[PDB]
Structure formats: structure tokens, C-alpha cells
Amino acid sequence: IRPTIGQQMETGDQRFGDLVFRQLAPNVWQHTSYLDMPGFGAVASNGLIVRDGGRVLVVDTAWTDDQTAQILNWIKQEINLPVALAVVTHAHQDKMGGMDALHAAGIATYANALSNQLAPQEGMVAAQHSLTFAANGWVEPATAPNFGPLKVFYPGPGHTSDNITVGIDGTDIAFGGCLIKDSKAKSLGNLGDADTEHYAASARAFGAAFPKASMIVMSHSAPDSRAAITHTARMADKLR
């Protein structure tokens, strides 16, 4: 319950099985799951759950199929609406480790085409459907049908070459996934698959795609202010 990496539990957190849920807005919750590293401890990872138009939309899986099934069970108990689709934000275990559980539940899955192409090489199951992007970063609309309030944006290579981001129209929330680190972070996390030349511009592009959002949600820290974007970009400036 006390991760080595990731935010600790706080007031407003609901423990459900091995996961933690936090309501961020009337129709938006953050899911948190934990992977125990032998000799190191637990690493927390965050995604989103959105209620729109009688259905639920999921952003990112948990680390494993079992944890992702637990997300679906929490949805059933707390929201009790069908889960129409999930979007996963790049091909690494913290974001895509639970694809099989979504597929077995009948949930349609979407990822950047490049995420689907990298998925097997990264140990992940590909999503069923591929999103593609305009040169300006915005999703090609016919590849993202019935996405409700989700606004999917590819900011450019950064944490990985395939990383995508998601804003929730009608809210104060935008989700940077593993691209954005919090405003007090000391590092950019795992740079092993990263594009250090383009990272800073990609972080700034995320901020400019979602100019209004004041709640920046991210994979390994509690939601932060827009200072997370500026700090991430300035940390990334030093990589060039």
C-alpha cells in the first residue's frame, strides 16, 4: 500500500482489492495498480475511468490481466454501466499489461497504430483497433468512432515514440500518461525507449493541445497543476 515509486494513498482514495480509485470529477476517476519489484518494492501506475452517455471508457490497463479484471469489477460495483472501449497510451506493461482481460470481457480496444506494431516486441498484446494521427497530432476522426468526450492527441516522440495523450472535453482534466512527470520530479523516469531530442517539444505540444486543462493526470504521480508540463519540458530541455 506504500509504493516505492508513485504517489502514496491520501484522503479521497478508495481501496478495492489490490487497487486504489480516486474520483477526480463527477464522471471521471483515476485507477491505480501496483507492481511489486523483487528487491525494490511496489510501483504504482495510474489510468482513467470516464462515464459518458450511459457507458464507461477506460484509459490504460493495469499492470496485469488480473488487476485489469479488478478494475472491471470495481466499475461493475460502483458505476454499473457497460464498458464500451479502452484506449491505451503506449506499448509498455504499465499501460498495456492487461489487454487480454479487456478482450475477454468484450471491450473494444484502441491504441496508436505504432503501439500495436511495437506491442509484440514489447511483450504486449496489441489492441484490436489502430488510431492514426494527423501531422498536427490530432487523431484521425474515423479511426476513433464514438469516443464521447475523449480527445486523443499524439504529441510526438518523448517517453516512447508511440506515446499518446487524452483530454476529457467538458472537464478540467488532461492525461499525459508516462510522458508527463510531476512538477517536483527529479527525473524523467525510464528513458530507455525515449527520444531525448524531441521530448521537450512533445511535452510542450501536449500542453498546447490541451491549453485549458488545470488538472494534469499522469502515470506515476498524483494529479498536478500545469507546472508538471512546464517542469517536464524544462527537464527534457537538458537532454538536448
Footprint of K ion (CB under 5 A): 193
**Under rule CB under 5 A, residue 219 binds Zn ion:** yes
d(CA 32, CA 48) in angstroms, rounded, equals 9
Residue 231 marked ligand-binding: no
Asked if 180 and 188 count as a contact pair (C-beta separation under 8 A), the reply is no
CA–CA separation, 220 and 217 (whole Å): 9
178 has binding-site annotation: yes
Q: Which residues contact 19 (CB under 8 A, 6 or more apart)?
A: 31, 32, 33, 34, 62, 67, 70, 71, 74
The helix or strand, by DSSP H or E, that contains position 76, with its residue range, turns out to be: helix 65-78
Instruction: Report, in angstroms and rounded to the nearest whole number, the Rg of the chain calculated over CA atoms.
Output: 16
Query: Does residue 92 bind ligand PNK (CB under 6 A)?
Result: yes
Least CB distance to ligand PNK at residue 67 (A): 12
Q: Which stretch binds ligand PNK (CB under 6 A): 19-27, 68-76, 87-95, 106-114?
A: 87-95
Which C-beta is closer to ligand PNK: that of 51 or that of 95? 95
* 11-19, 63-71, 84-92, 198-206 -> range binding Zn ion (CB under 5 A): 84-92
User: Under rule CB under 6 A, which residues in 144-183 are in contact with ligand PNK?
Assistant: 178
Q: How far is the CB of 145 from ligand PNK (least distance, A)?
A: 29
AA identity, residue 127: A
* Residue corresponding to grid cell 487480454: 100
Smallest distance, Å, CB 129 to K ion?
A: 22
Side chain identity, residue 179: L
**Residue 195, SS3 per DSSP:** coil
Candidate list 37, 105, 208, 227; residue touching ligand PNK; CB under 6 A: 37
Residue 225 contact, options ligand PNK, K ion, Zn ion, none, Cβ 5-8 Å cut-off depending on partner type: none
In the complex, which residue's CB is closest to ligand PNK? 189
Q: Compute the distance between CA of residue 198 and CA of residue 237 in angstroms, rounded to an integer.
A: 9
13 annotated as belonging to a binding site for a ligand: no
- Yes or no: say if 144 and 192 are a contact pair by the CB < 8 Å rule: no
Shortest separation between residue 59's beta carbon and ligand PNK, angstroms = 15
Instruction: With contacts defined by CB under 5 A, name the span among 10-18, 61-69, 93-101, 222-230 that binds Zn ion.
Output: 93-101
CA 237 to chain centroid, in Å, comes to 23
**Annotated binding-site ranges for Ca(2+):** 65, 100
List contacts with Zn ion (CB under 5 A). Answer: 92, 94, 178, 219
Q: Which residues are annotated as a binding site for Zn(2+)?
A: 90, 92, 94, 159, 178, 220
